[PDB]
Amino acid sequence: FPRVKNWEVGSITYDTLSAQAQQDGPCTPRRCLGSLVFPAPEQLLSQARDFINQYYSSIKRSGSQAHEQRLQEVEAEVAATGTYQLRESELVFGAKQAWRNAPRCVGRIQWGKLQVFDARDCRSAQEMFTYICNHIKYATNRGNLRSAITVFPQRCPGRGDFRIWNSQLVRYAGYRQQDGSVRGDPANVEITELCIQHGWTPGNGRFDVLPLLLQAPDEPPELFLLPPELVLEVPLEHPTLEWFAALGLRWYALPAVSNMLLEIGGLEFPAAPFSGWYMSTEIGTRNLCDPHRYNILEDVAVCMDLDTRTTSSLWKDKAAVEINVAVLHSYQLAKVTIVDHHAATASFMKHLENEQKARGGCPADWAWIVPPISGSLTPVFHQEMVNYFLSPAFRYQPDPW
């Protein structure tokens, strides 16, 4: 069992949950690959049993009659058909556990309070669009954001998948310009391309919300426009730099990831969009400051009259902090839920304490838990962490094209 020290407090724990790591990560005793972004019917039965036992243990009913009857039901269904279906309560338990097991998520103190929408009876792309609109409506909640997930029908062999082609439900278009540069979000050139080849009329703003490319089984992707009143947006302004508003920046309220595969008890749900609320550094540092994103850092530093000729005036650092101040101020002014990285990491430290009692550990990816600015000023920087893969899980998947 690995020893795990918090060097701030001096406190020691042992991670016994890691003993139950499902599959294999990328590291070996010869070399560590922890910074890498992307590393049978018998097999399905074995995972279904594991998961059913997990569910029945978590409610303190292991060995009960209902437990035995559920296992027998799954054995019979897998024998007859090669698969099985989850009861709604097992689906709820599974989607929560997948969030709880997500090593790169700093927001897991919230894992128990997730709303799960059962969309497994969904039949068409049009019907899928209705579920996604209900989800966005519920999750946004006029700016009082609420974590949620909508689970579309499971994969089954010999049948096409439901897929959401967009990587997130709300994204800004990125139009390639005459000279090889992008107008809008450059992280989205390929998805913007696909939208136009499928009949979308593009715009030319920096903040044009993309349509949804939805794919029902074996049917090609169908274009769906999101009603503007449904996408809540926040104009970015700064509390003391009056000119910041004039940059015309803005961002959307709802981070809604739509390209991951949910895996529960050997079943796979390729369309299972989920959402929560933002940590400010995601917007301020990643989306507005990364050189491959909106890359505004130089423009802000000019407006602040900073000496941008030498790296040692720390103009990049000054400009980055004020952008993050503007994000927090604008979301709070607009009454849209947001959390700063100091509050987020403090709550994640509490989540680690809770998880040690409940399960004897917590899988955590240190490079993604530590915020991308002011790392060592947060309590997670000096916290040793163990990374391993538990099931249920969210997983990356190949693109649908």
Next chain:
Amino acid sequence: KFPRVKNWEVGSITYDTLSAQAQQDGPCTPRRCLGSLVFPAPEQLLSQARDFINQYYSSIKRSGSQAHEQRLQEVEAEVAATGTYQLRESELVFGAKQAWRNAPRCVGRIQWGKLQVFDARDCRSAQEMFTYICNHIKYATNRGNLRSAITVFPQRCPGRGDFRIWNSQLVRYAGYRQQDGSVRGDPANVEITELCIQHGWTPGNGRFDVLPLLLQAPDEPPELFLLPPELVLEVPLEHPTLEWFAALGLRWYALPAVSNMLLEIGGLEFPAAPFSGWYMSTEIGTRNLCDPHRYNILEDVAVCMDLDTRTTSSLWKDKAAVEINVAVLHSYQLAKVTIVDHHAATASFMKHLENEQKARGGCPADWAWIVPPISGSLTPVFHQEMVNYFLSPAFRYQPDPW
């Protein structure tokens, strides 16, 4: 077959083939990663020595030559007759530069080939040790134009005690425990401060008292050696536009000189081999002055800047840390003492990764330690994937001598 490593800011892809030489086993396994942990006979020696000899002769393009064969024979024979062998001076120089070049946590490795190696293997007493150390400090400091250096004292050998430097750095500030439970000075040094006091040092009572050296000669109790004040170059800390900052009374020293690691070369161990470079500014501003178990000035600076400290969403911590770092870089440049900011240091590390891919087919690097402690994603190493593994020659930790 070989790990593929991507830079997500440029899109470039390399394959790390040097990891196949990995001469040790780290803490990770296929089932869990522990890459964030801080602290994870004759033919054993002969095999490590032969691999080191092979490296040296490959480096000067002379593999398989007669000198390469003859040197292998000599080392085999020496180990057989005596249990150990002696490095030639040129191999020791190569060995010490390789140990720096192989340190996965070091961001300043672009400079690895310009290490100045001082050979103190003929040292015989603690007084002779102190003389070599004072020369090291004077050479490395160079009146503010800092220069990389390592002094290597005699290797560990059976039948004789080790040379050791009890201090973890040649230059450290005392930490005095106060009756109210708090610490005056550097809290990370309360233990070595107590030891210096037991071995006869008359303490001061300031916040930046430089500690004496505790030097141990083979099979002797350690002896105390005061550093002449003109030897230890110090920088008063001030801020270019916040005039009250000088009133905080803060200073730091010019020279980071690590003195408690063990240098390992071809199966030989040098338990006393202090080395020094120059600071990256986040080491002083963020780690030494802001960490809660160190001088812990963040909130007092934030109050003095008139920041709202009751809520975290003002980001007062981040604003105060940036200004502390500004003051560090400004102060060292004013005093004409070498210092590098984390933006310049990480850009040159990116250059080093390119150089090493051409030279050796890879570079071992601990992402968590290479990415600076503030403004991580604003530097080019944040989006650069990295492979961590142990190569030899190498610096390594060793137990404290008491």
